[PDB]
Amino acid sequence: GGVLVAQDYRAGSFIELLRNRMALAGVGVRILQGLTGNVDIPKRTGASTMYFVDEDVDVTESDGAFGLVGMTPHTAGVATAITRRMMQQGSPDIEALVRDDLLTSLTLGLDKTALVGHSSPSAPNGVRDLVIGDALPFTGPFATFEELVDLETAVASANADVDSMAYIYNAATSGHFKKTLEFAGVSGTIERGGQVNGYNRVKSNQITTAGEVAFGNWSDVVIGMWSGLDLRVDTSTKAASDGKVLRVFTDIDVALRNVESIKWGVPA
Amino acid sequence: GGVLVAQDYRAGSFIELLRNRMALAGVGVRILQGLTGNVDIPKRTGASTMYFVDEDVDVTESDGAFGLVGMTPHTAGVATAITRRMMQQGSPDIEALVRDDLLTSLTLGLDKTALVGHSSPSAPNGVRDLVIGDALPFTGPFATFEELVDLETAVASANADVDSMAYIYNAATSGHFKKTLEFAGVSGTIERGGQVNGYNRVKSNQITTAGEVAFGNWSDVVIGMWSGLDLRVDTSTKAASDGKVLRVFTDIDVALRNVESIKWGVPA
Amino acid sequence: GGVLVAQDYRAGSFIELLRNRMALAGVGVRILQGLTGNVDIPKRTGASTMYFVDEDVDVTESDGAFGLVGMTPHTAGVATAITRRMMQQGSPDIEALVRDDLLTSLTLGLDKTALVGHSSPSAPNGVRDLVIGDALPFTGPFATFEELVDLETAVASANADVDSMAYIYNAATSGHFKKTLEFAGVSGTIERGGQVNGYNRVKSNQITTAGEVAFGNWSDVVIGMWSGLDLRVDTSTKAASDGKVLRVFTDIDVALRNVESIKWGVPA
Amino acid sequence: GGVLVAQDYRAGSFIELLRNRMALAGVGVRILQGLTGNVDIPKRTGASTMYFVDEDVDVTESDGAFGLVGMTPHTAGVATAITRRMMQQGSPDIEALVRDDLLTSLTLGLDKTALVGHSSPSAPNGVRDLVIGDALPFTGPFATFEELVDLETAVASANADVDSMAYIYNAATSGHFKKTLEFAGVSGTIERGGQVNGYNRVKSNQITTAGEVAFGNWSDVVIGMWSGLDLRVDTSTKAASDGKVLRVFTDIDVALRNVESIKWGVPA
Amino acid sequence: GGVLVAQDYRAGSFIELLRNRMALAGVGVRILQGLTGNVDIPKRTGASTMYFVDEDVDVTESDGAFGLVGMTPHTAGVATAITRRMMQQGSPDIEALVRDDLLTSLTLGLDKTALVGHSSPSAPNGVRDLVIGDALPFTGPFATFEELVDLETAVASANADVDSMAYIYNAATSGHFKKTLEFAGVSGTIERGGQVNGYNRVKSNQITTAGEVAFGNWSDVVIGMWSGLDLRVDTSTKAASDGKVLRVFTDIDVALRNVESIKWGVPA
């Protein structure tokens, strides 16, 4: 009764405790809303000037400029297919395994494209696209403690400070900020406790680049969600040879109130 | 039924969230007064000299010098216009917007001139205009911690010492005072907990220069007011088009008592 | 007379306080299960992707991939003999001595074989056997504080980090961590107060080599025990002279779900 | 019309808040007395010595020297003259201003010349004149902690060390003291809050030189007042114009008991 | 007529304040008991070995190894004899003195020979002799900190670690520890406070050599007291000439459990 070829009763047990995928993290500081129709908010962007004048000499007329920000829904959506046989024989089921998979793969996609601009036309330009025009280099594969304060000045130099800001960087950067001394010979390091420079960090892997770090007042970043999550189940699109496709849509747009409330550093 | 046309009914939602353009922050620790006429205050600038003399020899006569400090009203004001159609259909009250912007841009405009002398003639002389005659250089883009002690001495050396002095430096400089140690590996940075060298700072953004830093007893500068912020709402002008014009005037002047009570930084 | 010879009725005492074996210590922070037949676990190893489209544009269908992990029993056993006379006249009860020897000499063998694979060809593949392909050399007889956090970032980069992870290193390596500072001039040593980098250490001797360390989320491995520790008395093998032979068998195997949850040190 | 040579009724508002002159400070730790005649007080120098002898072996004799210190009035005073018209039309009381100038400008002059000797014949010998003979160099534009404690030992090495002792140095030297550590790497400045090397300081401006600093028990300086301040009013002099003259006189002399109670260090 | 020679009638005063000798300290950690006959206690020295079998392959039997440690009374004596005259003329009570000098000397001799083996045959084998076989050299007159934690690791690499272990070293070594730092440029000495490396120390001079330091769990050494210290004053031995002879006997033996529970470091 050797187990080799004459006792091949041993088959697969197939315990259904699925090893699920590893997913990234998100953000928790910004603001949002649910609405309909186009939206526009007025912006000041201009102020009157002061004139010093002699006696009996007339002053002039100075008038402020104006402008308005706007948001229009750009739709997004993921869709997948399931043939008949897969539907017939799915061990954890295919009607429910793929269902939540779609939602969890779309929520993170939206959260990523809101932060970093998705490289595709007809897609809402992300925050990194609206502020990369003044990217601060780091003259090194990573950022020293000097630059992490430079970013804070470049934001405070524009009078945009609410003393509740946050840094954002991936993990491979957070590693270097863990094993690097703050100064020449002083005790502390850069990323001690949960803070960095008195402000919090988030350590999210959404920013794919290695040494790319972002800072600024995230409170004035608005995102317009015109609709929730749809999760439309379909059968007719593939029914000649039986099959059931799944799909889910959502539309969104991103904009920020002041262009300089965020600073973006790029590792040179 | 696309949304390009044949769908001209999309509505531009208008939300009332006007945001004032970024503004600076003032600095008040000074001395002021409301009055009329020209003004004058006498000041002693000389003292007698003691003489040691032997038995029965005549002493010498020494005479002190005097001086006075004078101020005269300098005039400054701002104004702008509003037509009729703009006033009627305005989503926020355009009147209130202008009526607030004028006062804000004048209040902020005055003290900046008080610190840094305005570039136009017929404008009052700022503190920087008077004390820049002597000015300690810095031998670098920013001020090493030792120069911040040289300022405190150069005032103490003239025995103008009061125990409530304060530093004033640009916001962009304050970044250079948090990434720099006092001494090599000494465990303390320059600006700690909103204090420097045991004295307070203000960290205003009025000082438009990079590394200029002022210091001294600011209870020794005197500004002269002749009239508060007078808001003249004017409708007789442009009355043929029924468009009113708003204007505001105020006269000011500034001069400090002891020239050696302030010092300037002048990075070079 | 004297106590030299032929005057020896002096009692010889026999106290019952055994000196023990001085074995190693365990680990025990993992998960396990009881089985039958070969087991396979499904594991999702792909994700769908979103598509940004404007009005009236089809969304592309996208699909993920799947995979599964397997386990198969490998058997480990121990056995020993005992005669009748030893049982007849034993100073402590011998059969319990040998039973406890068997049990605690098999449990520790299994623990060691889990982490480091045993040498025999018919042996379960240890964690070191699996995750050694991704190995981070140390460029020295031990590891500095740099690499000792480099492991952490090489784990957390794959999003596979849970708040409660742990380090594992040989007992002859705890001492090196103790005698070395993290950075040059600052105070503080690596093995500091029962932890190393905010995470716990275990300091076992199962790791035979000198400077091998291992870090990762220790809830991501599974050991499959097909049968508990069963004890057989086996009186019949030596009934020709009434001799028992105690033996204990057990067959297990080990595997981990996500390969990027452990990191090996392997100093060079 | 506007301000013009023709239009100028505007008056000159004369506010009587006299900005005063910036004066120096003095000392508060010495002793003195109101006197007459000429004073000589004896002080012992040296004492007898101990001798060891054999049994019935002759003993020898010794002796102890003596000495005395003396003080003689040195006369000093200041005086100025005000005309007649300037008393007729004077905005404050022109007399009282001159009186309160003379009194303080004489008190400070005497306190100045007592500490550091005045540079003129017929002037009393200041402490610097009496103790500069054994002055201690510095080998630097300023003094270092080594000398800041050598000044302490050089007083202790003469048994003249007493519990109450104080440092005295120019205000320009205090800033330098602050901007310099005590040792190489330790975190500590020379002058902490109101303390130097466990002792007090006064930090006046009387010491005209930068690097000079004095130390020692200041209870050994004795100054003698032969007469209070006179403040005599003259009218016979300058009577052809009815002009008053104000004079003050005082005689004084300074001498310290034990020459080693003070130590004086000069920069070099 | 003199004091020196042939006129010396002065009596030489005798004061009974005996200046005693100087003694050592001892040890206070280990365990002991009181017994009558020989004592043997059993310890296991060998365990079964695990095995992995190819399918259908018999597991081989593995047998443990046993041993036992024994203690036999080794007897000591200490005796001295005072004579009659020395007892008739004695300023302190001489037999009250020698009786103390015997007890203290015997206690300290037993203590010293228990720790360091006495250099004589028929003397119980001291702790040092059981572990001096393997000994960690120090490469210098004393052991630095890294060399000091090697004793910790050596016991740790034998699984014999207990929560309360201790260090023992000469008093001359305790100097070389109190005056040397743990790490260069860090504020910490080796023999800090009252502990070393987080473990207790006991300073004693029993270790006659210079830099030998011992370490290990001292609760693992046992010592046997067959009979306490007995005075046993004797007269009839030296009775021919009257005398009082004193002799104190005691018989003990020392033995160790886990040889690895003690590590010995010799300077070289």
Next chain:
Amino acid sequence: GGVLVAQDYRAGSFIELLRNRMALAGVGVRILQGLTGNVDIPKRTGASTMYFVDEDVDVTESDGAFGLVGMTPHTAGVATAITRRMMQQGSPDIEALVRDDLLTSLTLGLDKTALVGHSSPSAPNGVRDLVIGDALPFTGPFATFEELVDLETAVASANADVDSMAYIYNAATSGHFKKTLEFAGVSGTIERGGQVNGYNRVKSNQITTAGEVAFGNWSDVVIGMWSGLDLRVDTSTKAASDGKVLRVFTDIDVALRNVESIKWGVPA
């Protein structure tokens, strides 16, 4: 009427506030007595050895030695002469001055020669005289922290230590201890606070040389005070000029009981 020959009337004031000669300090930790005739005390200096015997072997009798330590009074005195006129016209009472000088000049000489041996035959052996053979050089002008702890080590290395000890060093040595670090990195000075190495310190210029320093249990030094401070007024020594002479005698000697209770520094 100027102050010259024409003004010789002004007198010469004599004030009786004399100044005492600044003296040294003493000692407050030793022990002494008042006695007559020679003195000596017995000191045990031998320990009875022990032996390990065989089964039936007699312990070999052994003996201890005894030592006797004693002292003999040495003499010492001082004397100063007064003439007749200087006694007739003395501004303070001259005999009072010399009688209050002699007693102190003798006490401070007795203590001086007790601590440090006088350099003259027929003078008592000072504590320096008895321990200078066991001196410990300093390889420099002053001693570092290493030798400062080395003295304490070499004292306690002879079982002669007790909790109440003290250092003694010249004022200059104290100043040097104040100006240096024990380890360059560590904060604090050799003379931090009132202690030096956990024990007290007393400084006094009695020790004449630069960096000699002593340490050890000071309650181990006895002083023999045979006679008080004998005062003698001698008028007949020189009556040919009617001039008396004052003499003061006192006999003393010093010895220490346990010789290894002190050690000396002798900076090489």
Next chain:
Amino acid sequence: GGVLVAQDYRAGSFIELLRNRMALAGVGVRILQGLTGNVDIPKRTGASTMYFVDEDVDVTESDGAFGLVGMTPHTAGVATAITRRMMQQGSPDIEALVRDDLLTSLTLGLDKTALVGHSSPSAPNGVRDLVIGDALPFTGPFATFEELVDLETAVASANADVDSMAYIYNAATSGHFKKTLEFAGVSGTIERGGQVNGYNRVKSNQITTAGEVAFGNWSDVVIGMWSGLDLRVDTSTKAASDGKVLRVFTDIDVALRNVESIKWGVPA
């Protein structure tokens, strides 16, 4: 009032009971089941052997061999369309009328391909496809009695015999058997009543070819129903003209448990 255009009273009777298609005959003797997921069944092959031992002989061991048979689901289905008009004017409920058309035409089609394999890829191989590897030629258009009894003997020799077997042939071969003798001059015909050789026949036209005759136990054919015959009404396709489409699907597979239980004729 005859039956012409004069009489319009008569209407179309249209009795609803439908006629039917001339469909072939099935089998209905075999086995089936309902399952899910890929399948296999463990069969046996060979067994142990019996041994006749003497009085005291041990009986020996013979190994048993094993093996399995698996099946994979092949798919099939039919579908036809229905216009909107034909659902309004259908005299029976048209969908209920077209269902039966689809279910019977599918069941019969499955019976066809199961017995004789469909000539198309992706079609489950029929019984003829599995056993035709060995079949007795006939040497003529049909088979005599000898071959029809050899078909029985070749199965009975393999012990695959069971009483309820059956022949199968095409209607034409049955007619031929009816019109011919078993042997020349023998009254009995090859086929008579319901038997051919004492066993039953089925006389179906599923075997399209002429002359092929199959024999064997038809209780060894196993077919696997992976899903009931599900009905899918489709309305999304052809939804412009409102026409709906009916569809039906199923997944089956055929495999016989004992390959030698059937034989085939295959004339020539």
